[PDB]
Amino acid sequence: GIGTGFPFDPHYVEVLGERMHYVDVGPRDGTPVLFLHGNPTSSYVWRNIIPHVAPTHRCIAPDLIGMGKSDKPDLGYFFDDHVRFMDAFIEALGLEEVVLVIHDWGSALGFHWAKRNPERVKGIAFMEFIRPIPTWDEWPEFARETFQAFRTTDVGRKLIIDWNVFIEGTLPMGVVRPLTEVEMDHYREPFLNPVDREPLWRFPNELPIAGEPANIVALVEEYMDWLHQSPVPKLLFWGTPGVLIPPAEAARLAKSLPNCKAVDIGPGLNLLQEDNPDLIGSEIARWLSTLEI
Ligand SMILES: [Cl-]
């Protein structure tokens, strides 16, 4: 069934003094499609989606700094750090116009970049994306107590850094179907050493929940306001019950956002790519054929 391999030849580019790894496949010409993963994944999360798009479009899938095969500088790994590295990655590859395919923290990066570079975005496909979570009641009940505990320097660092709970617990709890041992080993590989787990803990502490942190909430509100008035073509994938995006929120956005098509992938939590990669990939390819790219 769902592929477990990661066949892609490694590419690296140096930005801000550090190497970022990326997948780069597909034809060399045309408008490239840039795939941005989130927490606690890597370009591995796109492995079964890219092959539907790569016949006809260049596919670029970087690993965020400190994640995947990318370098591990001694950083706080705040969202702001990821913004600087991704801004530099995009420019270092000489990308001009792009289509974005974005998920989780990759979607905050993608939307924030699109807001600041709107002339260069030809379309955005997005799923299980960062939006303001106004209260803890709007976080899924099944995941509420653990995410509240993650957002502390005592229990949260014990769980995420020392016990590897984000990889061993939260990740499988973000996929409806069972992950195999081989898939788990691909997700574990960047984080075998606890000293390398800072991004896994800082990311949930950056999530915009109940107004906190104020700076992230403001930045996310700004890109959501931009998205609501942007003519950019939009493709929204969602599942039931979801995690960041409940079905009601997907339906609300499908109506409120200009030029937006929405696609139900079936059962899904956070890593929709792991529950229905073939629908996501095939639908991205079909939608791309309708764009002026
Ligand atoms: Cl997170």
Author numbering: 3 to 295
Which sentences did the original study use to describe this structure?
Self-labeling protein tags such as HaloTag are powerful tools that can label fusion proteins with synthetic fluorophores for use in fluorescence microscopy. To engineer the binding site, ten amino acids on helices 6–8 in close proximity to TMR were chosen for randomization by site-saturation mutagenesis. The changes in spectroscopic properties result from single or double point mutations in the direct vicinity of the bound fluorophore.
The brightest variant, the double mutant HaloTag9 (HaloTag7-Q165H-P174R, ΔI = 19.9 ± 0.5%), as well as the dimmer variants HaloTag10 (HaloTag7-Q165W, ΔI = −52.9 ± 1.2%) and HaloTag11 (HaloTag7-M175W, ΔI = −44.8 ± 0.8%) were chosen for characterization with a panel of 46 different fluorophores and analysis of their photophysical properties. HaloTag10 and HaloTag11 decreased the fluorescence intensity of almost all tested fluorophores compared with HaloTag7. The decreases were more pronounced for HaloTag10 than for HaloTag11 but in both cases caused by changes in quantum yield. For HaloTag10 and HaloTag11, the proximity of TMR to the introduced tryptophans suggests that photoinduced electron transfer (PET) quenching of the fluorophore is responsible for the decreased quantum yields. The decreased quantum yields and fluorescence lifetimes of HaloTag10 and HaloTag11 presumably result from PET quenching through the newly introduced tryptophans. Hence, HaloTag9 showed the longest and HaloTag10 the shortest fluorescence lifetime. HaloTag10 and HaloTag11 decreased the brightness of all fluorophores relative to HaloTag7, HaloTag10 having the biggest effect. Photostability measurements showed that the higher the fluorescence lifetime, the more photobleaching occurred, making HaloTag9 the least and HaloTag10 and HaloTag11 the most photostable tags.
